[PDB]
Symmetry: C3
Subunit: 116 residues, 3 copies
């Protein structure tokens, strides 16, 4: 059994599958500048990668949520996050403050999920 | 095979099990204000979640330890951590500095463990 | 099935294996003081731990890359990283800013990999 990959470049693959596990690269926003829009864009990108890798939102196992300013943006993050999640099926989660690769990025989320 | 969950709310589940793996949400302290007490409270909460999920301390696979002030609190963290761990059975570990969701939180720990 | 461990001390094991998974402790540099040298030293240590644990670079599933100064060092990190990776086989990746246990440490990397 060897890992399979989705959207591979010289630095990373957007997803790596092995056994029944899906490992996603941390996903960053599109063009939104605000925390609400950026969180929507991150979660939408995760949604698509899960689909490509044979998983789905109900089968997320863990998410690390990185916020550039956790005090300022935690409430907005939770608002978009809880609406995005399938009811009653929230994953394990860790939310911490960290600067991301670009200063305009307010939120980045790293997901591990189950294939199925 | 579908994931099972423990202590699910609208934002997260305290634990998600899949296959023989246990994914715990990052655990934060109780009411302690000092690094020693907070680390004890975090590890005790992890201890209970492992028990609920069919694991135990000897079967931890990985721990990310987030410290609000790694320079100040690293030694105290290690003191409580090494005493809490079963002898000779320490897991893989990563210790980094990050602000947590509340400024009074000095330590948060995210564990993945093996069911058994 | 119980976890097995490599290079266990009172705080951590350099590697923990379970099922077909390898969990590595975050690896820190040797004596280099510059970002290029430190990244080389980190990746070399990861390379050896994978070998000891029955894995290899082509079977990395995920890497969290912590940089002390992501704005300053991201380009240098990517330069060493992309050269170190086997062609076409990059893993899932997340790169964030975090202070490490010593102020002289500029980079720390935490890998999960597949045994095989």
């Amino acid at each position: 059994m060897e890992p399979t990959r989705i959207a591979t470049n010289d630095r990373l693959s957007a997803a790596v599958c092995f056994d029944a596990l899906v490992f996603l690269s941390g996903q960053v926003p599109g063009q939104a500048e605000d925390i609400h829009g950026q969180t929507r864009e991150v979660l939408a990108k995760i949604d698509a990668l899960l689909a490509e890798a044979g998983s789905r939102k109900e089968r997320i196992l863990s998410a690390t949520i990185y916020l550039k300013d956790i005090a300022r943006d935690f409430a907005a993050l939770n608002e978009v996050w809880t609406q995005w999640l399938p009811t009653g099926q929230a994953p394990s989660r860790t939310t911490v403050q960290a600067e991301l690769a670009r200063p305009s990025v307010l939120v980045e989320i790293t997901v591990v999920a189950a294939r199925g």
